């Protein structure tokens, strides 16, 4: 039980940590993708202007 | 003939001056924006959109 207790607690902490990491990284990837797309639209504007 | 040419040129030059005065006058209205980018690699807001 005590062994099971420690196993359970450690696994739960590891799971919550991984979840928080992946969620925040998902937010980051969203932000960087927004950067990319908005920059692409700037690229299209510039292309039209130059042509 | 010289007088007629002079009067025609004078009228044309006066009209051109009247136009060109304002042509040079307010030509800075062409100042506008270019909307460059900076990649916004520093936005770390939170999910609290209630204003929409």
Short mmCIF file of C-alpha atoms in Angstrom, two decimals:
data_model
loop_
_atom_site.label_atom_id
_atom_site.label_comp_id
_atom_site.label_asym_id
_atom_site.label_seq_id
_atom_site.Cartn_x
_atom_site.Cartn_y
_atom_site.Cartn_z
CA UNK A 1 0.00 0.00 0.00
CA UNK A 2 2.62 2.54 1.03
CA UNK A 3 4.56 1.43 -2.04
CA UNK A 4 1.36 1.73 -4.06
CA UNK A 5 0.71 5.08 -2.37
CA UNK A 6 4.05 6.53 -3.45
CA UNK A 7 3.71 5.04 -6.93
CA UNK A 8 0.27 6.61 -7.31
CA UNK A 9 1.36 10.02 -6.07
CA UNK A 10 4.45 10.10 -8.28
CA UNK A 11 2.58 8.95 -11.38
CA UNK A 12 -0.14 11.55 -10.76
CA UNK A 13 2.40 14.36 -10.38
CA UNK A 14 4.22 13.24 -13.52
CA UNK A 15 0.94 13.09 -15.45
CA UNK A 16 -0.14 16.56 -14.37
CA UNK A 17 3.30 17.94 -15.21
CA UNK A 18 3.23 16.42 -18.69
CA UNK A 19 -0.29 17.73 -19.28
CA UNK A 20 0.67 21.27 -18.27
CA UNK A 21 3.78 21.14 -20.45
CA UNK A 22 1.94 19.91 -23.54
CA UNK A 23 -0.90 22.42 -23.05
CA UNK A 24 1.44 25.40 -22.76
CA UNK A 25 3.45 24.12 -25.73
CA UNK A 26 0.22 23.87 -27.70
CA UNK A 27 -0.46 27.52 -26.89
CA UNK A 28 3.06 28.36 -28.03
CA UNK A 29 2.62 26.46 -31.30
CA UNK A 30 -0.63 28.30 -31.87
CA UNK A 31 1.13 31.62 -31.38
CA UNK A 32 4.02 30.77 -33.69
CA UNK A 33 1.64 29.51 -36.38
CA UNK A 34 -0.23 32.81 -36.11
CA UNK A 35 3.10 34.56 -36.59
CA UNK A 36 3.74 32.52 -39.72
CA UNK A 37 0.33 33.06 -41.29
CA UNK A 38 0.13 36.78 -40.61
CA UNK A 39 3.63 37.18 -42.00
CA UNK A 40 2.52 35.26 -45.09
CA UNK A 41 -0.34 37.70 -45.61
CA UNK A 42 2.19 40.53 -45.38
CA UNK A 43 4.17 38.67 -48.05
CA UNK A 44 1.14 38.59 -50.33
CA UNK A 45 0.55 42.31 -49.83
CA UNK A 46 4.16 43.07 -50.68
CA UNK A 47 4.05 40.86 -53.77
CA UNK A 48 0.99 42.68 -55.07
CA UNK A 49 2.59 46.06 -54.40
CA UNK A 50 5.83 45.21 -56.19
CA UNK A 51 4.13 43.71 -59.23
CA UNK B 1 1.18 87.70 -84.09
CA UNK B 2 3.74 88.22 -81.35
CA UNK B 3 1.16 89.92 -79.15
CA UNK B 4 -1.34 87.09 -79.67
CA UNK B 5 1.30 84.47 -78.87
CA UNK B 6 2.34 86.43 -75.78
CA UNK B 7 -1.21 86.76 -74.47
CA UNK B 8 -1.97 83.08 -75.07
CA UNK B 9 1.25 82.01 -73.34
CA UNK B 10 0.57 84.43 -70.48
CA UNK B 11 -2.89 82.97 -69.91
CA UNK B 12 -1.58 79.41 -70.10
CA UNK B 13 1.30 80.18 -67.73
CA UNK B 14 -1.01 81.90 -65.26
CA UNK B 15 -3.36 78.91 -65.23
CA UNK B 16 -0.42 76.53 -64.84
CA UNK B 17 0.94 78.61 -61.96
CA UNK B 18 -2.45 78.63 -60.23
CA UNK B 19 -2.61 74.85 -60.54
CA UNK B 20 1.03 74.19 -59.65
CA UNK B 21 0.91 76.37 -56.55
CA UNK B 22 -1.56 74.04 -54.88
CA UNK B 23 0.08 71.08 -56.64
CA UNK B 24 3.23 71.73 -54.64
CA UNK B 25 1.27 73.03 -51.64
CA UNK B 26 -0.41 70.01 -50.03
CA UNK B 27 1.52 67.09 -51.51
CA UNK B 28 2.35 65.56 -48.12
CA UNK B 29 -1.04 63.89 -47.83
CA UNK B 30 0.70 60.90 -49.43
CA UNK B 31 2.15 60.08 -46.01
CA UNK B 32 0.53 56.82 -44.93
CA UNK B 33 1.44 53.56 -43.19
CA UNK B 34 3.41 50.55 -44.44
CA UNK B 35 2.40 47.89 -41.87
CA UNK B 36 5.63 45.97 -41.47
CA UNK B 37 6.02 42.93 -39.20
CA UNK B 38 8.12 41.87 -36.22
CA UNK B 39 7.07 38.16 -35.88
CA UNK B 40 5.50 38.92 -32.44
CA UNK B 41 7.64 36.33 -30.66
CA UNK B 42 6.71 37.73 -27.26
CA UNK B 43 2.94 37.32 -26.86
CA UNK B 44 2.09 35.14 -23.86
CA UNK B 45 -1.44 36.15 -22.93
CA UNK B 46 -4.08 34.12 -21.12
CA UNK B 47 -7.42 32.68 -22.22
CA UNK B 48 -9.88 35.14 -20.70
CA UNK B 49 -11.77 36.41 -23.75
CA UNK B 50 -15.09 37.65 -22.40
CA UNK B 51 -15.23 40.86 -24.41
CA UNK B 52 -15.25 38.69 -27.54
#
